Amino acid sequence: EAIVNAQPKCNPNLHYWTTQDEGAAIGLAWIPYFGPAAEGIYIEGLMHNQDGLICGLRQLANETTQALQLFLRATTELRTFSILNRKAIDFLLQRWGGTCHILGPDCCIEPADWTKNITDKIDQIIH
Amino acid sequence: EAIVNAQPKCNPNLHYWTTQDEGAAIGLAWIPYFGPAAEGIYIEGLMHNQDGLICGLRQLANETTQALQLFLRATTELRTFSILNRKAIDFLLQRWGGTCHILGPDCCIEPADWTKNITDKIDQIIH
Amino acid sequence: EAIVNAQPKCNPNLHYWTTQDEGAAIGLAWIPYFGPAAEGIYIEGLMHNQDGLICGLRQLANETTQALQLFLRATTELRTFSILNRKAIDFLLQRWGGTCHILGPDCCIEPADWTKNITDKIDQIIH
Amino acid sequence: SIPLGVIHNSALQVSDVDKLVCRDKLSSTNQLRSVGLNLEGNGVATDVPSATKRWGFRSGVPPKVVNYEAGEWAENCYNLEIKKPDGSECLPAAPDGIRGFPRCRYVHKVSGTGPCAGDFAFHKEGAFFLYDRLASTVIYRGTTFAEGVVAFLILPQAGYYSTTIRYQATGFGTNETEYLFEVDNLTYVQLESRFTPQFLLQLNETIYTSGKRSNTTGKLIWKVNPWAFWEXXXXX
Amino acid sequence: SIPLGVIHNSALQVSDVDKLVCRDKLSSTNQLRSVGLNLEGNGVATDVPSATKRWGFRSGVPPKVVNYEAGEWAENCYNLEIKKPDGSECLPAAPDGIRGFPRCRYVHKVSGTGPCAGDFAFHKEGAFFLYDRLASTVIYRGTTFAEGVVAFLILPQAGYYSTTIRYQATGFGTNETEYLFEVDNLTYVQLESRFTPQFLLQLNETIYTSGKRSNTTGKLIWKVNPWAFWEXXXXX
Amino acid sequence: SIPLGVIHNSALQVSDVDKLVCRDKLSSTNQLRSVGLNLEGNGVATDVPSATKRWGFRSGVPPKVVNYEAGEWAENCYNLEIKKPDGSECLPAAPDGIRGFPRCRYVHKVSGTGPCAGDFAFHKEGAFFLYDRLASTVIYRGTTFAEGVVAFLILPQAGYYSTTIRYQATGFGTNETEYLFEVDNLTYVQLESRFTPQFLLQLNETIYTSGKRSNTTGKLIWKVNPWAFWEXXXXX
Ligand SMILES: *[C@@H]1O[C@H](CO)[C@@H](O[C@@H]2O[C@H](CO)[C@@H](O[C@@H]3O[C@H](CO[C@H]4O[C@H](CO)[C@@H](O)[C@H](O)[C@@H]4O[C@@H]4O[C@H](CO)[C@@H](O)[C@H](O)[C@H]4NC(C)=O)[C@@H](O)[C@H](O[C@H]4O[C@H](CO)[C@@H](O)[C@H](O)[C@@H]4O)[C@@H]3O)[C@H](O)[C@H]2NC(C)=O)[C@H](O)[C@H]1NC(C)=O
Ligand SMILES: *[C@@H]1O[C@H](CO)[C@@H](O[C@@H]2O[C@H](CO)[C@@H](O[C@@H]3O[C@H](CO[C@H]4O[C@H](CO)[C@@H](O)[C@H](O)[C@@H]4O[C@@H]4O[C@H](CO)[C@@H](O)[C@H](O)[C@H]4NC(C)=O)[C@@H](O)[C@H](O[C@H]4O[C@H](CO)[C@@H](O)[C@H](O)[C@@H]4O)[C@@H]3O)[C@H](O)[C@H]2NC(C)=O)[C@H](O)[C@H]1NC(C)=O
Ligand SMILES: *[C@@H]1O[C@H](CO)[C@@H](O[C@@H]2O[C@H](CO)[C@@H](O[C@@H]3O[C@H](CO[C@H]4O[C@H](CO)[C@@H](O)[C@H](O)[C@@H]4O[C@@H]4O[C@H](CO)[C@@H](O)[C@H](O)[C@H]4NC(C)=O)[C@@H](O)[C@H](O[C@H]4O[C@H](CO)[C@@H](O)[C@H](O)[C@@H]4O)[C@@H]3O)[C@H](O)[C@H]2NC(C)=O)[C@H](O)[C@H]1NC(C)=O
Ligand SMILES: CC1(C)CN(C(=O)[C@@]23C[C@@H]4C[C@@](c5ccccc5)(C[C@H](C2)/C4=C\Cc2ccccc2)C3)CC[C@H]1N
Ligand SMILES: CC1(C)CN(C(=O)[C@@]23C[C@@H]4C[C@@](c5ccccc5)(C[C@H](C2)/C4=C\Cc2ccccc2)C3)CC[C@H]1N
Ligand SMILES: CC1(C)CN(C(=O)[C@@]23C[C@@H]4C[C@@](c5ccccc5)(C[C@H](C2)/C4=C\Cc2ccccc2)C3)CC[C@H]1N
Ligand SMILES: *[C@@H]1O[C@H](CO)[C@@H](O)[C@H](O)[C@H]1NC(C)=O
Ligand SMILES: *[C@@H]1O[C@H](CO)[C@@H](O)[C@H](O)[C@H]1NC(C)=O
Ligand SMILES: *[C@@H]1O[C@H](CO)[C@@H](O)[C@H](O)[C@H]1NC(C)=O
Ligand SMILES: *[C@@H]1O[C@H](CO)[C@@H](O)[C@H](O)[C@H]1NC(C)=O
Ligand SMILES: *[C@@H]1O[C@H](CO)[C@@H](O)[C@H](O)[C@H]1NC(C)=O
Ligand SMILES: *[C@@H]1O[C@H](CO)[C@@H](O)[C@H](O)[C@H]1NC(C)=O
Ligand SMILES: *[C@@H]1O[C@H](CO)[C@@H](O)[C@H](O)[C@H]1NC(C)=O
Ligand SMILES: *[C@@H]1O[C@H](CO)[C@@H](O)[C@H](O)[C@H]1NC(C)=O
Ligand SMILES: *[C@@H]1O[C@H](CO)[C@@H](O)[C@H](O)[C@H]1NC(C)=O
Ligand SMILES: *[C@@H]1O[C@H](CO)[C@@H](O)[C@H](O)[C@H]1NC(C)=O
Ligand SMILES: *[C@@H]1O[C@H](CO)[C@@H](O)[C@H](O)[C@H]1NC(C)=O
Ligand SMILES: *[C@@H]1O[C@H](CO)[C@@H](O)[C@H](O)[C@H]1NC(C)=O
């Protein structure tokens, strides 16, 4: 479903922070005793509105809220860390949760490179 | 393994509660500030013993207890929320954790619809 | 990548404890009320340095520390229990996260047993 | 090891971990369900004397909690406020986010004392204490629970009234426990195992309407001389 | 149900849970990202009077926390120390491991009192309080947050200055709230919605340098007579 | 990034995240294992003077815990009760569910004081404190741990005695720390790095049987003038 930003304004530029994954730090900076304090673990970046992605993202976050709040209301878990892992599981179950019927629309198996293997093997057998 | 209810009694009817997933609520009821209190988030249903499923379920829950208690004894996690996600992962690993040998009993790949594609392509090439 | 133990010493023998999974206990020992206390839930084993695996393991644990510490620095989760489940998910996504191109290097689909099915079906059709 | 229930051939079965059924289709984690079933539904006695003999105190075993997503409306739940004779609490306060079992026709609220010879109260048959979508191995203070057990299912691809019944107890958790059903703060009835919730509520209402409540400042205790739920002085 | 954003045809879209795109490739959990966007960036008023009217107290609803991995530098964050008139705390201490939002140009630190008619303070529009990579449904005492919302993405396969602005409040969380901007412990300015952070900081600096601070032991209050951020007595 | 150990060609290797081995078969999460290895087994000195110099106090870094499923029987574990000279505790109480390391031949229980210039005690080489199937970045008060490191494995498809050794310390966590081995509450031996656990236990037993314990009310301190484990006054 397409995303229609319907907000009074959009800040088109995204000045963000996050954590560097993985890190590969310099020297002993990876050691908790020697490394940064809580305030110093962040990286930053700046993203512009190419392809409308920033204004689209602001609207996506807005529209996610209802389903995410309803999910939080129904969990008894105090802090939820598992949403992305569960989405990745559901991604796999959507494709591989049943028998894969080759050439079927819900089967992500590309037989083409092997079709040419059998056909070249048959042209040879016929010749 | 078949399930043999071996209890002194079985209540054949299951009057249950759970939470509505997802919800798609009316108006602003999804907003925590405005929505139901802890007591009001539940739905209810009633299931009868068609196919013996209620008495079977009571016995299944009874027989699950030993393995579930042994699992809880060995985890250091205070509250366990991950059993179903791990079962779903194990479901996928059972089928896709190794090379899928087509026509092999442990490979859930149905090549039939494509066998007819190659055979109709060969009958044409022969004719 | 091969593992080069670079420690001042290696204890070549691994006297270990862990928990018995699953258990299948005797009588009622699985019941928390009747079963072992926290001190009595452990099994033990002894492993020697066949194939260099113990000294290799000591070095592997040593070299894992930097990446594991960097991962712990970036999570806000107080206690992390999900590393192995996420590795299992990543295992599946590496193999099945996209379209499987048969005979392609990143597609773990063995068509051989079925190639012989089609070829024996073609030799019969030709004869 | 942990069994998973699956419907095959119009019957519920335990899924064979060593046998792969390619016909079984798991197309999302929504098809998986953890559920709680009440001991009540298997025919166990639910009167407070019989129920409390299923629970016991034990030290050395860390408590454990597991979640479940759907539960069964209970006829009987229990809510315990037990102290030692020296006033100290026998049960731990409910941890953050553990609420009472959400559907209870009768809540048997038992207050009183026992020796509590152990750090936590466990189910002697290995069942769980079912709270609000959390199942625990132990009993929390003042928190309503139903006794029950948990199952895990893979699904096929395709009002509410509650009444609290109050009791006093001495020698809780022992062979020689004494239970009084509480009519008001000074009027009690000797509790027997055979008394149903319905009988206790009528006993209460007829004591109120016949003036059999205490009208001194002292404790009045009464004695009484004379199938599953889904199917001193004296009096008569 | 929970939407997942995906780029198709050079545009962001919500992924169709009922339609399977085999061309979409998820080759590791690293390609999945949970992110927090600030309400600020949608054009909401951020002045303390307007912002605090978006928050309200409610009982009966357990608070909930969800994590997110990347956030947006904020122009405006808030940090609340609210008590009832009897001195009791209106907000809970931050739970273990919940730290303040990490990038805030201005931290509006509001201290004062209100009736706090409810156990927790929630966002009346359903947004979250964004802390350090944890989003909560409620406000923690003395903990800096930005208002925002969370999204989930599947990625394609292939300095810092902060200034704290202090305020006193009475009737917090009501229709009739009063805000004073704090110059020192005895000098305040009547707060109006139109005052920007930049204006408040210059107002402060010109009060300090023109001797308009209190030089009694008593409280001096001043009044003042006379586009998004990215684009008594009297005075004039 | 986090390495995963796998057996190939009769040798343990780190799994290449950028190379796919279709021959590797992961048929259940049971084949994955998190394990803890003891620093001891790499040849580090385990005497209390040498061991405690590997630990240091630091503020600003939130502690972190990760679980592991199998551990190594330890020859040396440590259990610390350290206070500042003003009596305040230097180490936090063990969080709920964190128990001592379960297999320790010798538990070096060190009590005493230091300046504790930091909120938590960390391993200066980046190793973990191994408790009961939880590895922490920090030391908990009065909780037995072994120093060690964690590995993650994919497996191929196909009695117990403990002795506590007690010590007193001053200037803990500094360059100039002093250690006394405790014979009884009034008899101590100046601790040197070269003293093994076995030597300390024999030293204790020969002090008891030769009457070298204190028989005043005052503190008696003794001095002594005269390969890995798997392979005042004076005296002689
Ligand atoms: C899953 O379902 C199972 C079936 O319902 C549950 O089984 C129950 O398990 C507990 C043990 O944990 C048993 O408790 C024991 O009961 C013995 C006597 O009880 C018999 O008689 C009473 C009459 O008062 C009756 O209510 C019971 O139903 C029970 O039935 C008979 O039992 C005898 C064996 O003695 C058997 O030969 C009969 O065939 C059987 N009748 C039938 C099947 O129709 C007590 O003696 C025991 O007490 C001793 O042991 C205790 C420790 O275990 C200890 O505390 C005591 O001090 C004493 O030393 C014990 O209490 C239940 O009887 C049993 N129920 C049934 C119907 O079998 C199982 O618990 C359940 N799992 C979970 C997790 O809920
Ligand atoms: C996702 O994005 C959405 C779009 O930005 C967010 O929508 C916002 O939702 C809240 C409800 O939760 C609305 O709050 C209501 O505002 C009503 C009046 O506000 C209008 O006028 C003010 C001027 O002061 C202006 O700031 C607003 O932008 C708003 O715009 C107009 O609103 C009218 C409807 O009245 C509409 O017809 C116009 O078209 C629209 N103009 C446009 C679109 O250009 C108040 O009357 C409401 O108060 C009543 O209801 C409350 C309970 O809901 C209660 O507390 C009050 O006491 C009173 O009874 C209410 O406050 C926002 O207006 C709305 N914003 C927009 C731009 O639509 C959405 O919240 C967001 N989701 C998350 C999770 O952040
Ligand atoms: C994974 O395995 C690695 C290998 O075992 C572990 O490496 C260890 O890492 C720490 C750093 O975190 C090092 O500690 C430093 O030691 C310096 C001197 O120690 C040398 O000599 C002592 C003799 O007392 C001996 O015990 C050591 O084994 C060490 O060996 C020699 O070191 C020199 C370098 O100086 C090297 O050239 C030699 O080749 C080597 N000999 C060999 C290899 O045979 C100290 O000077 C250091 O102190 C300074 O820096 C500290 C901060 O890092 C600071 O606290 C101090 O105040 C001072 O400024 C430092 O203590 C260990 O030596 C090193 N061990 C080995 C054998 O290399 C690694 O820790 C491990 N990972 C985990 C997570 O456990
Ligand atoms: C959002 C939902 C309510 C989620 N759902 C459910 O929670 C369930 C799924 C399943 C088991 C239920 C249950 C079991 C034990 C205790 C309490 C409840 C009853 C019924 C609905 C059901 C029936 C099938 C069944 C299979 C095998 C044995 C017995 C029953 C819960 C499915 C429908 C959906 N609308
Ligand atoms: C370690 C990393 C920093 C992890 N990364 C990221 O955290 C992100 C991934 C994604 C969204 C980001 C974001 C969104 C909302 C709020 C704050 C940040 C900006 C940018 C980097 C991005 C850009 C793509 C995009 C897709 C769809 C809509 C908008 C943007 C975070 C990816 C790069 C990697 N080096
Ligand atoms: C329930 C179980 C006990 C679970 N298991 C295990 O916990 C293990 C799996 C693995 C590593 C073990 C370990 C490593 C480090 C520290 C402590 C223990 C020793 C041995 C049994 C083993 C051997 C294989 C190996 C591979 C690669 C390097 C070194 C050893 C734990 C497997 C057998 C099963 N019965
Ligand atoms: C408990 O109950 C009875 C007596 O009431 C008897 O069988 C048993 O020995 C008693 N045990 C104790 C410790 O009183
Ligand atoms: C009965 O006693 C309880 C506690 O002892 C008390 O809270 C309650 O108010 C009392 N009721 C009356 C009517 O005195
Ligand atoms: C007992 O009867 C009185 C009078 O009808 C009533 O107020 C009280 O709530 C009853 N108690 C119970 C437990 O129903
Ligand atoms: C007072 O109490 C006595 C004994 O409980 C009872 O006989 C009498 O009926 C009570 N008074 C009234 C007015 O009922
Ligand atoms: C709150 O605000 C105004 C008056 O200031 C009015 O519309 C509303 O009724 C007030 N409500 C209360 C409870 O004072
Ligand atoms: C201002 O007041 C606060 C608390 O009332 C106090 O902590 C601070 O030290 C005071 N500052 C001065 C300069 O008195
Ligand atoms: C107000 O001005 C004084 C003097 O320059 C300065 O010390 C103080 O920090 C300022 N307050 C703020 C909030 O910037
Ligand atoms: C003292 O305060 C008064 C009123 O606030 C002000 O007019 C005067 O300038 C102050 N003193 C100085 C030296 O500025
Ligand atoms: C610590 O140890 C020695 C002296 O004992 C010396 O190298 C170092 O400077 C000392 N540091 C301090 C702060 O005493
Ligand atoms: C030794 O001292 C400790 C604490 O100072 C005390 O608990 C213990 O009882 C003492 N032992 C003797 C024999 O006095
Ligand atoms: C020291 O020796 C005495 C006497 O044999 C014994 O009681 C005590 O436990 C010993 N201490 C240790 C740490 O073994
Ligand atoms: C009393 O203590 C002294 C000094 O520690 C020692 O020489 C003597 O042997 C002790 N008494 C006995 C009876 O051993």
Query: How close is the Cα of F28 to the center of ligand 4, in Å?
Result: 27
Cβ-contact C14, C54 below 8 angstroms: yes
Q: Say how far apart CA E149 and CA A65 lie, in whole Å.
A: 7
Atom 14 (ligand 5) nearest CA: E35
Residues 6+ apart with CB under 8 A from E133: A19, C76, E67, E68, E69, E71
Chain A residues closer than 8 Å to C86 by CB: 85
Chains meeting B at 3+ CB pairs closer than 8 A?
A, C, D, E, F
Q: Say how far apart CA B14 and CA B18 lie, in whole Å.
A: 12
Tokens representing F122? Answer: 């960390």
Say yes or no: CB of residue C13 within 6 Å of ligand 6.
no
Q: Does A104 touch chain B (CB under 8 A)?
A: yes
Best of B1, B5, B10, B11 to disrupt the D interface (most D CBs within 10 Å) is B11
Query: How close is the Cα of E54 to the center of ligand 17, in Å?
Result: 68
Q: Say how far apart CA C91 and CA C96 lie, in whole Å.
A: 9
Q: How far apart are the first and last CA of chain B?
A: 52
Measured CA to CA in angstroms, residue C119 lies from B104, C101, F49, F81, F187 at distances of 17, 21, 75, 76, 89
| Solving technique | X-ray
Say yes or no: CB of residue F201 within 6 Å of ligand 17.
yes
Q: Does A35 touch chain C (CB under 8 A)?
A: yes
The residue assigned the tokens 């050079």 is: E10
How crowded is the C-beta side of C79, counted as CA atoms within 13 Å? 17
User: F129-159 burial, b if ≥16 CB within 10 A, otherwise e?
Assistant: bbbbbbbbbbbbbebbbbbbbbbbbbeeeee
Cβ-contact A102, D92 below 8 angstroms: no
Query: How close is the Cα of A10 to the center of ligand 3, in Å?
Result: 54
DSSP A28-96: TTTSTTTS--GGG-EEEEEE--GGGHHHHHHHHHHHHHHHHHHHHHH---SEE--HHHHHHHHHHHHHH
Chain C residues closer than 8 Å to A110 by CB: 99-102, 104
Return the closest-CA partner of residue E66 out of E153, E150, E165: E150
The residue assigned the tokens 């859930």 is: B108
- Bridge partners for E56 per DSSP: E122
Domain chopping of chain D, boundaries:
1-236
Q: Say how far apart CA F28 and CA F129 lie, in whole Å.
A: 29
Q: Say how far apart CA D21 and CA D23 lie, in whole Å.
A: 5
Atom 14 (ligand 13) nearest CA: E201
Say if the Cβ atoms of E25 and C89 lie within 8 Å.
no
Chains A, E: CB contacts within 8 A come to 157
Q: Using CB atoms within 10 A of its CB, is residue A68 exposed (0-12), middle (13-18) or buried (19+)?
A: buried
Atom 3 (ligand 7) nearest CA: D175
- Bridge partners for F34 per DSSP: F152
DSSP F220-235: EEE------TT-----
Q: Say how far apart CA C56 and CA C64 lie, in whole Å.
A: 12
Return the closest-CA partner of residue D168 out of D214, D219, D131: D219
Q: Say how far apart CA E88 and CA E107 lie, in whole Å.
A: 24
Tokens representing E235? Answer: 């005075």
Chains A, D: CB contacts within 8 A come to 30
Atom 9 (ligand 18) nearest CA: F211
Q: Does F133 touch chain B (CB under 8 A)?
A: yes
Chains meeting D at 3+ CB pairs closer than 8 A?
A, B, C
Say yes or no: CB of residue F175 within 6 Å of ligand 15.
yes
What would the 3-class secondary structure string for F196-220 be?
A: CHHHHHHHHHHHHHCCCCCCCCCCE
Measured CA to CA in angstroms, residue D56 lies from D77, D82, D90, D136 at distances of 17, 12, 11, 14
Q: Say how far apart CA F205 and CA A63 lie, in whole Å.
A: 74
Q: Say how far apart CA D112 and CA D173 lie, in whole Å.
A: 11
Q: Say how far apart CA E202 and CA E185 lie, in whole Å.
A: 18
Question: To test the ligand 10 pocket, which listed residue (D215, D219, D221, D223) has its Cβ within 8 A of the most ligand atoms?
Answer: D215
Q: Nearest-CA distance from B6 to chain A in Å?
A: 33
Q: Say how far apart CA E110 and CA E145 lie, in whole Å.
A: 12
Beta strands in D9-113 (DSSP E): 11-14, 32-38, 55-58, 65-67, 70-72, 74-83, 104-113
Q: How far apart are the first and last CA of chain A?
A: 52
Q: Nearest-CA distance from C1 to chain A in Å?
A: 17
Chain C residues closer than 8 Å to D123 by CB: 31-33
Q: Nearest-CA distance from B40 to chain A in Å?
A: 11
Q: Nearest-CA distance from E65 to chain B in Å?
A: 12
Tokens representing F16? Answer: 């290449």
**CB atoms closer than 10 angstroms to residue B44:** 12
Chain C residues with CB under 8 Å of a chain D CB are 21-23, 28, 30-35, 37-39
Return the closest-CA partner of residue C86 out of B85, E13, B63, D110: B85
Nearest ligand to the CA atom of F182: 17
Q: Say how far apart CA A63 and CA A60 lie, in whole Å.
A: 5
DSSP B14-33: EEEEEE-SS---STTTTSTT
**B90, closest residue in chain F (CA to CA):** F28
Question: What's at C63, amino acid-wise?
Answer: E
Return the closest-CA partner of residue B18 out of D10, D221, C13, D68: D68
Q: What is the DSSP letter of A112?
A: H
The residue assigned the tokens 């089967």 is: A107
What would the 3-class secondary structure string for chain C be?
A: CECCCCCCCCCCCEEEEEECCCCCCCCCCCCCCCCCCHHHCEEEEEECCHHHHHHHHHHHHHHHHHHHHHHHHHCCCCEECCHHHHHHHHHHHHHHCCCEECCCCCCCEECHHHHHHHHHHHHHHHC
Structural element, H or E, at residue D153: strand D146-154
DSSP F54-94: TEEEESS----EEE-SEEE-EEEEEEEEEE-TTS-BSSPBP
Best of C73, C76, C78, C102 to disrupt the E interface (most E CBs within 10 Å) is C76
